[PDB]
Amino acid sequence: TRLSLEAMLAERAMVARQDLAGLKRKLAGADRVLAPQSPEQCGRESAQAQARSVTSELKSAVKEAQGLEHQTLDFLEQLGEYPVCGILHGDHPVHPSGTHNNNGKVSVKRQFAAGTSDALTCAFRFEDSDLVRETALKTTYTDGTWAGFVQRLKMQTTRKCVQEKVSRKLLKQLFPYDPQKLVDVSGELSELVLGIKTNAIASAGPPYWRTKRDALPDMLDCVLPLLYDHIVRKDLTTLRNKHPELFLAECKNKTDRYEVESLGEKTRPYFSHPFHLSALVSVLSQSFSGALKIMTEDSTSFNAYGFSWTNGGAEDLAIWARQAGEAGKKPPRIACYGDDTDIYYRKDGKLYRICPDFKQMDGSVDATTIEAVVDYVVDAHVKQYPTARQFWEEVGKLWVEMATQSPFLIDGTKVYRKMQKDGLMTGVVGTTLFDTVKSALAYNDWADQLMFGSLNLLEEKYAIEFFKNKHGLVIKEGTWKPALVNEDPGFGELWTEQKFLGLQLKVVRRENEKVYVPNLPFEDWLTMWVTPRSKYRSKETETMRERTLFDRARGLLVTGAVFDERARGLMGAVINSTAPEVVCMRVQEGGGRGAPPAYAFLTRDGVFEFPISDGYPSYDWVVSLYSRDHPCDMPRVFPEAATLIASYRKQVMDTRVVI
Amino acid sequence: TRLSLEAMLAERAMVARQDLAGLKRKLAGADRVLAPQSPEQCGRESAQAQARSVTSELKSAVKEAQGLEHQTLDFLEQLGEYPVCGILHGDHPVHPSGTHNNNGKVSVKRQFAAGVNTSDALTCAFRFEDSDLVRETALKTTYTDGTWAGFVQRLKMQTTRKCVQEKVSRKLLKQLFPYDPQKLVDVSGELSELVLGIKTNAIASAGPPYWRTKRDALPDMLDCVLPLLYDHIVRKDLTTLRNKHPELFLAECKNKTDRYEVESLGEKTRPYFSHPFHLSALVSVLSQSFSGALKIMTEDSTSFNAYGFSWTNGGAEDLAIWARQAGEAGKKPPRIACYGDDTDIYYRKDGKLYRICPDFKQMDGSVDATTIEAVVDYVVDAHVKQYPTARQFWEEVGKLWVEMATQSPFLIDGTKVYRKMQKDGLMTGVVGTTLFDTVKSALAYNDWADQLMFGSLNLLEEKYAIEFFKNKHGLVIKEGTWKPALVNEDPGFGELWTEQKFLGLQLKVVRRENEKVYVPNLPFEDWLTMWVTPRSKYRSKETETMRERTLFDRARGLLVTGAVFDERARGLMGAVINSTAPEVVCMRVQEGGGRGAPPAYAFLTRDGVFEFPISDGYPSYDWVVSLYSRDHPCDMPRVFPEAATLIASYRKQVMDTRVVI
Ligand SMILES: [Mg+2]
Ligand SMILES: [Mg+2]
């Protein structure tokens, strides 16, 4: 008696899905269920050479833009230099020795490196050569450029803003929430802070200069109680003046997909705040976003922050939109998510959709909006939990400061500050909500003006002037183009050609029912496919790179690529060309279910889980994800994999037989 | 990727306990709770040299004994050679290519290696204990493969003894071995699910034709051989299978690596038989179900069965309560408990309680075929009476069980296949060995007890008892081991019931709060023998960390088994625990499901599974006594009370959000 044979089998299975050579051998000749795929266009040698040619040209384009000189930073206030923080936690300084330290002053260095071929090689292997080359040459995943970084930083720290007229009553109307879903912030702080969610590998900011996971004990055990003590004694000025690095941010260039042709003019900045400040404010921010209604749940709400497409969401959007009324008679339907908007109105009874773009919206976010949002979120909590009002009002003051006036490093030891409170410091906790409110306030006023009779605000020329003069918002010319909505699309038809949250809305068939699903043209799926958000990693083994392609193919199929013939066929070719042992190996990501899709708005929580790491997204299964309460199993690539790997298939052996 | 800080901390803690360098640093100034310990007696240098001298002398004794010539194997029937099994499972033969194959015939090679156990534990004993005693104790016993000479000598002894057929019926077995029929497994279920329920040792040999560990051979056994076996059972066609694939019924006769007395290495090495996995797993359905249903003597006063007795949670005291019911010899029934070849006998003479603990000499040679067949029939009948729709299948399995216990062909060394000349004599290692031994012993002691009631009170005396067990039951009682002892029926704190052992342990009373607690006990010298003779040989790639952690785990196991109740044994184990490095105490460990390897002693609990509460606690007197107490639960003390927060580098501080500012 050590263990049951059943337990023995279970343990053998765990080890077996870790033996790639063993999986290869045991899956040999197994029945494989193949996804639909496009036919091969060229051989491995040609596909790889064609991908290398594109990559070489892009590397050259990046190197040239990265060589451009950049403007001076004179548009910011200069604050001198900060001393490296000396606070100790036990045996070590919280600011690690010999890092981010130039002769005792805090220092940083911006990364603009000039360093994706695997996915591009696949696209050339299975898709049209000219189309793949032309698409892949337009966009690249890059650190960007000094010149474009400074240009964009200037644009969002020097804009003339308009202070919004906003009150708690108005925000209740535009952003209703469920008070019973707010976290009880009159509880103990440690336990509240331990509840916030964040990215384990994101930077903890100054003074930690480490990942959040590495810095977490220093933040929790050492800095947070120090911060708390000075908050409640109203003594933050002493802490700031003695330990300025505790309130210092870092201004960083965002590595991202960028258009090759504007690399020299556009790289997006964002700000990385100290871990203790962002974690503390996240208690309010994440509690509030968790409690917000979205527009499909409450027709007075302008909020789409929280909207998600699966489980009927896509159709919820359309049902909500069809309620839009005749302009100048009845309310339009306006949904705001960060700087993204979906606008519906009727003219002569016909439904129209507008999907305009703001230019560098964060530069237009005025300080009055920022303070009103903080006050609205704080007041929501203290109305429900009034015994903790004063503590969280102090936190709200920290939040406003972080969003508007934190000092920050860029490159070297020079500390900077924005000249004015106006302009949102992108990346601060709550960025998305600040953007959403500013947009909704502007569109709410727009809708009021329609009811006042100014129906020419339906027209681009006057709309652009209105948003600029009355709200300090820049609507990109050419983006205000009302489109006739196909209100009840037929099978395979689009709602409109416009995108919201990065996706089109389409109707497809399941049985004989219409299902609303996300969609994109092939070229847009291809752009995402060929520009993975990962740099050359020598660590990445052939097996890991092979598995990455499989996971990314699954992710795009679930996001809607299964509903485009070519995109579906490309992802299917990737899946079909994945080795059996790579399909069936044990994987870490997704809790062993396989890495979830990159697209953030499939579900409200943001966490999507594949049912199994060795399934693939068939049309039927993905459609079932977008249908309401209509479930389908994810199909296995190798139906017999479990028993093949275990080298055992149960046979019923009856003990009751006559002998 | 996106996680709560709470989950982030939990994940950090997991990583932290795998980083020995980090643990060492974070536990450096940690406040340590010390177990009671003996003081250091000599330095490391002197302790290692003294240990080296002992191992060197033992290695020499073993090599010489292993050189002794062995007697011939002519006392067995010889059956020729068997062909290597050719059955394929998918892409491979069930009998691995290029192993156990001599020109197409099945072959084995007995291992009699000259490597003893390790010297780490012996070094600790020299470090913290008296030099003469450690040396004298260590020279007496060694963990060894044994010798050819002793192996064959012992094999002959248990395959050639004249046995006495027992007079036994289902009615008598019901009387001596009551069981709960509702606890029997429903063997009219589907066979696969029944076989997947049996428990065995993942790394034991799967036997012929697999020649692999049970873990490695399991899919071959389950998916390939078992259904083949099943098909031939239900078609009454086993003869076809045996004649075509004889390796499917072949056993291996093996020398048991074990602790052995150095001075008898040449005369005594234990044989046992390793049967094919498919046979032992199939029969284990009945055997393990039956032992799960058996009553033990402390639950039913008619039962002679202690197979299933366990010491913790009041068991030790249950034994004493049960024993005190023994009556005046020749007037009222004694109290007799049988476990394998071990017995505990109680009777009263002039009202005074006496205890006998005799030893059988190689009892398996004495187990007669009538007893074996009766035990199988009783176990089968119990199941088919409770589950009558499966009578015929399990009656066929019972026939296989009897063959495996009495007549399986077997290899020893080379290709020669042998068989025991007679049915009599139990093939030690067959599934059910313990029960077969237990029934044979109980049948004999039941007859002994009957003779007392008939007036034969001279059977209380060794001379007449030994003659009776030989002549009436073919059992050999070892001279000098029938020595009735006055029992201390109500021992005071620190006092023994008797100095005798049962299941390897003495019975003692100790104090907990203000109550008496009955606990297992041993003299220091016996704990020391076990401590210095680990059941493990030298293994390369066994890092110092693993070796240090093994000493820690073995010290815990001995303390829990009863060493905490002997002052010197407690002090030696405590010295080892206290000298274990903090990072070794607090590191993450695999054994015991992350709680630390459980004690080697098998009878702490009935199911056999013992789990430590935490891998970084130590067994204090208070905690161990609580395990033997009837309910009284106690927490296992941590060696480093602050380890968790030190390792996490975080200790919660209450920060009130309701403050006025
Ligand atoms: Mg848009
Ligand atoms: Mg005994």
Residue numbers in the entry:
A (entry chain A): 11 to 125, 128 to 671
B (entry chain B): 11 to 671
What does the study report here?
Thosea asigna virus (TaV) is a (+) ssRNA virus that infects the larvae of a defoliating moth (Setothosea asigna) and the prototypic member of the Permutotetraviridae family. In a previous work we have structurally and functionally characterized the non-canonical RdRP domain of TaV (TaVpol: residues 1-674 of the ORF1 product), showing close resemblances with flaviviral RdRPs. In these enzymes, motif C is located upstream of motif A forming a noncanonical C–A–B–D arrangement with a unique connectivity of the major structural elements of the active site. Here we report the X-ray structures of TaVpol captured in three replication-elongation states, revealing high resolution mechanistic details of different events in the nucleotide addition cycle for a non-canonical RdRP.
The X-ray analysis of the Δ10-TaVpol construct, crystallized in the presence of large amounts of Mg2+ (19% PEG 3350, 0.18 M MgSO4), revealed the existence of a second metal ion-binding site located nearby the catalytic cavity, in a non-catalytic position. The resulting electron density maps at 2.07 Å resolution showed strong peaks of extra density in the two molecules of the asymmetric unit. The Mg2+ ions were located at 7 Å from the catalytic aspartate D351 (motif C), coordinated by the side chain carboxyl oxygen of D352 (motif C) and five water molecules, in a perfect octahedral geometry. The solvent molecules participating in Mg2+ coordination appear also to interact with the polymerase side chains of residues of D369: w1, w2 and w3; T353: w4, with the main chain N and carboxyl oxygens of residues T353 (N), P368 (O)M w4, with the main chain oxygen of K51: w3 and with the main chain oxygen of C3676: w5. The presence of non-catalytic Mg2+ ions at the polymerases central cavity were previously described in other RdRPs and recently, the role of these ions in the nucleotide addition cycle has been reviewed by Gong and collaborators. The position of the noncatalytic Mg2+ in Δ10-TaVpol perfectly match that identified in other RdRP structures prior to active site closure.
